Amino acid sequence: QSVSIVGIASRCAPHKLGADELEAIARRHYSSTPSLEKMLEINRKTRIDHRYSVFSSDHEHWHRPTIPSFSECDSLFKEYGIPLASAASARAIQDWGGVPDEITHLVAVTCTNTAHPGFDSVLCRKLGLKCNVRRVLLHGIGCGGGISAMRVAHELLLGSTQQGVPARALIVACEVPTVFARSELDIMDKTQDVNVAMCLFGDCAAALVLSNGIGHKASEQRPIWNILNCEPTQFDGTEDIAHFNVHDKGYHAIIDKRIPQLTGKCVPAGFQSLISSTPSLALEEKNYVPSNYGWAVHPGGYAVLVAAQDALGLTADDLRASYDAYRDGGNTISTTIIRILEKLRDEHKHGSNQKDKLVLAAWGHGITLETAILTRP
Template sequence: MSPSTDTQNAKSNQFGDLNLSIIGLGTEYPPYLLDPQCLNTLVARHYPSSPALNKILTINQYTGIDTRSAIGSVDHPLANMDRAPTIAELSSIFLKDGVALAVTAARKALHEAQLSPLDITHVVSTTCTNSANPGFDHYVCKQLGMTQPVEKVLLHGIGCSGGLACLRTAANLALGSSFRGKKARVLVIALEISSLLVRSELDSANELQETRIGITLFSDCASSLVLSNNVGGEEAQPVYDLLGWDHRIIPDTEIDLGFDVDPLGWKVVLSPRVPKLAAAVVAPTFSDLLSTLPNLPPNYKEAEDFDWALHPGGATILSGVEKAMNITPEHMRASYDTYINHGNSSSATVISVMDRLRQKDMDELAPGGKVKDFIVGCAFGPGIAVEMCMLKRNMNHVRRTLVTTGDVTPPESDGNRSDGEVEDLEAEVKDLKAQGEELGEKLSEVHPEVPEQNDSLSEALNGVELD
């Protein structure tokens, strides 16, 4: 008796042994850290007091972010002109300081992969904070010294989902090479410079009295990884094996989340529906992804059986997914750590979280002290797009660190925290989980006579958490 059509379709939708491995990762944050007071400083320098700006500054104190990484301090010249910088001025800085970050992140990933830039066969990149032609990836490859023919893909219009969208695209390119019996070593690069958009966003808040609070969340970062199809030649040990992925769009949500080009940069577009929409789609996406991976061990069935590398768009995203999936902050420890210490760097953040998760001090915070072999990666972007993947961590991997000491970044730590530092992070995560309640109380104190303003502020905070 022949198999039914449903059985055949189910089998065709399953992932087999893809033989795809992430063999190197690199993250590069710039050296400056902006604490919440920095935004207050800029507003006081350049804008009169107004209800919208006061709301933004109030919310800025309760995002749960201690510091946001940036390419310059609060005194950066482009943030302190008598006007907001033009898109041309922003692009010039991006192609100088941003590309430098991306080159260093790529070098870190290549170093760990034990590869030369000349070994790379494909490059898949993304940004939502630049629109140059040729794209920034052209200049990164040039500075890396890639003279060989390289297939390049630059993804645009995908915001915070970009890191995992690049990984998915890289995987499909690598599988195409495998089908042809050819080697694929794919360099993935995500780069975002968000900090210098602050004046444009503050102009809109001041002139239109809009509560624009993306400027309280976003930061700068470059991240990179190398994906191998393990065809031909000696290979570095995998950091993660890539087992499968899922991509989908939540219908009729185009107006809810976006990042629109403007003569003075880019403008965040968000609606109050975003956190609920995102949290609601995680469970069915996770369930569908599991159904395509029948060879997982039997003890990996529920969300709590896995570690999670979730893009930390904001506090309500982290807490919303926790509640929806019945997991704990410890499952998403690297997401919390990244959010608290660096903020949201859009597409570059999720690769940074994947890099952070495999470091030793994060192991100490694992649920019940037990690190999971399998990891769910997840990010959301405009559309609303949902990207999810399944990774298997190589517990025996020894991290190879390229320490940089130039102007781009300070030297890296060895990934080990003292006992006191681990306790500090645990305390910070607990504090972050309480941010929603605390913010509501503070807003009631600030505007007790206008309850509808409190509702508006809560909606504004909830609606800005993803991109």
């Protein structure tokens, strides 16, 4: 038997935050300073063609004279983020074709909200999940969160397979980083520390439905991929390579310059560990060649993709869906890997030919690479 992905959907926010838009927001509230000018200059070189915010150009978020309080940042996530998550979740359930009250597990993730109850609880009510649905809300993982959620759900579902009962997991990732855009601009102006987070991140929610294959119903979509194995690797390191630190007005991002370098060193090691821990693949030497797999890589930044591409012996065309998600959507944190799976799914529906095995990889906090291997059924 095996655990499979049986539904996929994503929903970026609706309002463009292009380079012109960001410049207009920045110069509205701050005088020219060298950090402001460097940030804007870098912004135009990200090679992101589109990213999106839940806040339209005329929204008060971009015009108010004050920085949103943390409580306001919370309310904004509830007002804009949760509906985005409910839509993406509903669409994934629709793709799956099954019924909401037959979902047994909910695995949710965000790094742009902290609340008690968490947004997973709200989602249960909005989607009409059963009263005994088994919820998990992941924290502390950041961009590794999409793969982290798949890893957890994969094992939970194997646990139900152990008991011989049906299990269907909804994975939901919800990120609204533009909520913190005003705070980050203000910090960058005050410290004159250039923050490339201003340039990279956008708003999105995405979801998967996974099944353990027990008690399959005719209404359910057959397996898109099977999940064979997931393997995280935490690498040695003084401090993390990215931080998202709490403060009075929300979270502040610290993005280390060394990320592309470290990506080049660690991704091949991560991949090697993934294969060696996969009993059905660990023995044969050919399984340790990256080009024998399709690839999906979390595009933390353009240079991050380049670094992985070169280190893995791949071509940019191998990573086409990863570049495409980055180019149209930007870095949407935990949701990005799901947007890439959707792109890959959609391309296969259009006669495209892809490898039989597919590796997912993404950096998560604690210098930890999350990886997964998926197989075509």
